[PDB]
């Protein structure tokens, strides 16, 4: 009685370098195994494959890193929901259906301050990463949205490093105050979505400043009867 084990992540990320592990037990001498990925309905399109040779030298365990190239997907804007993973060897063969997603890296939107006043400037930069938490230089497009919800200005910048410094945003003389939204996405094929917020309020000169200090930041059973 002899058996094989194929280990893969639950979902696949496009453009990610994904590690597939093959571990085989109960076999003598050595053999080669091929692990590839195809399209769900038919296996014609093969987005990548790998070849691993397992022996007593290798303890009958091998690893292969598959990658889904983003540009081999359908040019139409309708996504591909499922993808086949195929393992073929001399002694056996097996196939599996597994979903994918276009969420890949991470977009973190760094602003200098959470609050702004009229006629100020918003100093903003973005950090973009891949599945490996590595720079992943990609041209990123971010858009601004006002508290009323309309897209105001849209800007795009290429990535030399992974610290992307976007043009400063000028605040109008008489703006619409409220909670403002900044969205970031990669230009073409990536669905990775970063988001951040910042608030804008009209400045007024206080006649005097008032502070309110409690006894604690929480009300416990002790002070339920009296709170200084």
């Amino acid at each position: 009685e002899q058996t094989y084990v194929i280990s893969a992540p639950k979902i696949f990320r496009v453009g990610a370098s994904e590690n597939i592990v093959i571990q085989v037990y109960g076999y003598t001498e050595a053999f080669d195994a091929t692990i590839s990925i195809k399209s769900y309905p038919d296996k014609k399109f093969s987005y990548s494959s790998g070849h691993v040779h397992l022996s007593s030298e290798n303890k009958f365990q091998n690893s292969a890193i598959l990658t889904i190239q983003p540009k081999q997907l359908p040019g139409g804007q309708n996504p591909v929901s499922y993808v086949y993973l195929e393992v073929v060897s001399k002694h056996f063969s097996k196939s599996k259906r597994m979903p994918i997603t276009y969420d890949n890296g991470f977009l973190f939107i760094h602003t200098d301050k959470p609050v702004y006043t009229p006629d100020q400037s918003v100093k903003v930069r973005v950090y973009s990463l891949n599945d490996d938490l590595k720079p992943a230089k990609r041209e990123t497009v971010l858009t601004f949205i006002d508290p009323e919800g309309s897209e105001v200005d849209m800007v795009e910048e290429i990535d030399h490093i992974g610290i992307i410094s976007f043009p400063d945003f000028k605040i109008p003389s008489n703006p619409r105050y409220g909670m403002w939204t900044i969205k970031a996405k990669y230009k073409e094929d990536f669905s990775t979505t970063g988001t951040a917020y910042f608030e804008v309020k009209e400045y007024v000169l206080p006649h005097f400043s008032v502070s309110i200090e409690p006894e604690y930041n929480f009300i416990g059973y002790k002070n339920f009867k009296n709170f200084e």
Binding site: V5, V87, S95
Partner: protein, 337 residues
């Protein structure tokens, strides 16, 4: 029970340690235990029974056809997991009846990808067996470990697996640091300050000078610095503290899918998340018209230099606000005498 029989265990009591902040418990359950429900509460001396904290929980048994189960644990107290050290992991495979095993198989994952794999040889004599696992830099944010062995039944082959979640120290690649040459806490206006940046490797740095009062209230002041860790940890596909209902469920809680003979995983149905004036307030609040209530407010504002209707002539909004405005001005003029 599997017979649907409930038994109360003799209650256990412990105390959280000084270092770990964890009260440790161990329950020896009957062999045929299926589901275990337990309530944990605080006995603290100066707190009344009302004001003590309490939380209940439920636990389910791992289901296997071959009566073969597995439990893995990393032995420590005040768990740290320094990088580069050795992780000594105790494996207690035993309560299979069919158990004489060829080998154990290990898989190690971090940040949503498979960083390590291997196999160790089983000693057919002693039961519990230890594995020395190097902790590497691929594991920096956090990592999950999966261990499984196979048993050959007269019916089918069978996989037996268990998983463990591992929180590891946060240690960067570059470990970049910033300092000021006048490291004292006081500073004077216009004082020249030397800024020092030191990294373990060539790296790009970006700074921020943000007034501490920009955050406003001190409690709950969040930056990208604060949200970057947790918002970044979503790269991990798996959730929970480890374990599972069955072998395939252990793998899925680890965030994995497999292709074998013995055990068919169910990934098809798996897509899931996981963890005086009262007279004024009469008309004012009673009309309940969003446009009118304002007309009642500024209707009742004090005006010495013109009459109520003289102020009412400047209303362009229509009579709907005239009827309210005029009344709210009269009441204000009446009640202030």
């Amino acid at each position: 029970d599997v017979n649907q029989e409930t038994s109360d265990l003799d209650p256990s009591k412990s105390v959280t340690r000084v270092d770990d902040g964890v009260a440790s418990f161990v329950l020896n359950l009957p062999s045929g235990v299926t589901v275990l429900e337990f309530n944990v509460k605080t006995d603290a001396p100066d707190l009344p029974e009302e004001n003590q904290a309490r939380e209940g929980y439920r636990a389910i048994a791992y289901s296997s056809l071959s009566q073969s189960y597995l439990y893995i644990d990393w032995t420590d107290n005040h768990k740290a997991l320094l990088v580069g050290e050795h992780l000594n992991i105790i494996v207690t495979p035993k309560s299979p009846y069919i158990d004489k095993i060829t080998h154990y198989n290990y898989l190690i994952l971090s940040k949503g990808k498979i960083i390590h794999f291997g196999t160790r040889e089983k000693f057919s004599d002693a039961s519990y067996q230890s594995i020395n696992i190097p902790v590497t830099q691929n594991m920096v944010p956090s990592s999950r470990l999966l261990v499984y062995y196979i048993v050959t039944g007269e019916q089918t082959a069978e996989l037996v697996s268990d998983s463990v979640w591992l929180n590891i120290e946060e240690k960067c690649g570059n470990q970049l640091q910033v300092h000021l040459s006048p490291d004292a806490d006081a500073y004077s206006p216009g004082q020249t300050v030397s800024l020092n940046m030191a990294t373990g490797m060539d790296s790009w740095v970006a700074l921020a000078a943000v007034d501490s009062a920009v955050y406003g209230v001190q409690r709950g002041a969040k930056k990208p610095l604060e949200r970057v860790f947790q918002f970044l940890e979503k790269s991990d596909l798996g959730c929970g503290a480890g374990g599972g209902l069955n072998n395939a469920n252990v793998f899925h809680l680890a965030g994995l899918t497999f292709l074998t003979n013995a055990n068919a995983d169910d990934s098809q149905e798996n897509d899931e998340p996981c963890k005086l004036q009262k007279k004024i307030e009469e008309i004012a609040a009673k009309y309940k018209h969003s446009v009118v209530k304002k007309c009642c407010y500024d209707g009742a504002c004090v005006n010495n230099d013109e009459t109520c209707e003289q102020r009412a002539a400047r209303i362009s909004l229509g009579p709907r606000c005239i009827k309210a405005f005029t009344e709210c001005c009269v009441v204000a003029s009446q009640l202030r005498a």
